[PDB]
Structure 1
């Protein structure tokens, strides 16, 4: 079944994480987790739908990324039987890569390597929520509210089963790369907030 296949893939990632996200011991992989989520928001911004992306480092050492784009699609596509968002979040060598030389692997890898991940989508007048634990959804994507805003928010807590040594996000690593990303995708506003020490930055080119 999908269930079994979905779990086999999450297990493949968990078993050889470095190969998918990058080195799990020097902070390469850990920060890549953030840039992988941001990359999909960047794509939405390059297509003209998202104007601002906000990256927040929380005091519990989770990170959220939010955008003001269209929201990830919510409907159940016939042939998978779960929301399109859930397929994106669950269906699948970076080992020795360094920094910007890493290849894009998709947000399902971030999900597999997160102790917890929350997805919130504002789309078609409605707020939708799904929670995952090491990639396994708690429940099907669900409507929790009504809204006239649109956007996508991912918050994730990196698994301490995967990441060792460098386990806390370094503001400056995120600042440096997010600044480069805003330069490399002109027009897009990126904000970085650190709730640990109140640091904030706003990167934009025009």
Structure 2
């Protein structure tokens, strides 16, 4: 297993997301959604909320365990390793890092153990903060939130399509069972929820 930096993805995006058109743009959504879905599949979290923000960024929030908030080597947060090393609930191999590489900015927010942490990356996944404790929450509160702005210098289109996302989340709700998937478009105010009882 040869590990790579985020430059590798930016130089050959087609290798990781297939294309740099709308199909590729939406593959970024699929990667982050799929990480939330994997976490719910393992029994952690019963809702996954997706928001297309007015500024064109996209948020996915889960109520799973929260990505680990500790250190890897050399005082580097485990979260930073997930989002910045390409191994070409989990996590990676290779999703979070590919999305970060192809975003002009990305924020991850983790809630667990009574604490709220945040890390921000810019310009193709360069950390501009460490994993910072930003606040507190009840001990019962857990989850991972990822918001990213796709890189307009990579993609031919940076316009997320509500109907495309809605269909994928409907499908994911049907496969998962007993988990609510929601979509809210802040550009147009549209919203929908999916939940299949089993």
Three-state SS of the structure 2 residue aligned to 1:117 is strand
Name stretches of at least 5 consecutive residues in structure 1 with no aligned partner.
93-103
Does the 8 A contact of 1:53 with 1:66 survive in 2? yes
For 1:111, the equivalent position in structure 2 comes to: 100
For 2:10, the equivalent position in structure 1 comes to: 14
Q: TM-score, normalised by structure 2?
A: 0.90
For 2:118, the equivalent position in structure 1 comes to: 129
Name stretches of at least 5 consecutive residues in structure 2 with no aligned partner.
87-92
For 2:135, the equivalent position in structure 1 comes to: 145
* Count of residue pairs the alignment pairs up: 187
Q: TM-score, normalised by structure 1?
A: 0.87
Structure 1 residue runs of 4+, over 2 Å off?
none
The CA deviation string for residues 128-159 of structure 1, in whole angstroms up to 9 with x for no partner, is: 01000111100210101011121110000000
For 2:89, the equivalent position in structure 1 comes to: none
Tell me the distance in 2 between the aligned counterparts of 1:174 and 1:146. 32
1:74-89 maps to which residues of 2 (within 5 A)?
74-77=69-72, 79=73, 81-89=75-83
Tell me the distance in 2 between the aligned counterparts of 1:188 and 1:161. 36
RMSD after superposition: 1.5
- Cα deviation, residue 172, structure 1: 0.4
Which of these residues, 162, 165, 175, is aligned with residue 166 of structure 2? 175
Which of these residues, 25, 41, 49, is aligned with residue 46 of structure 1? 41
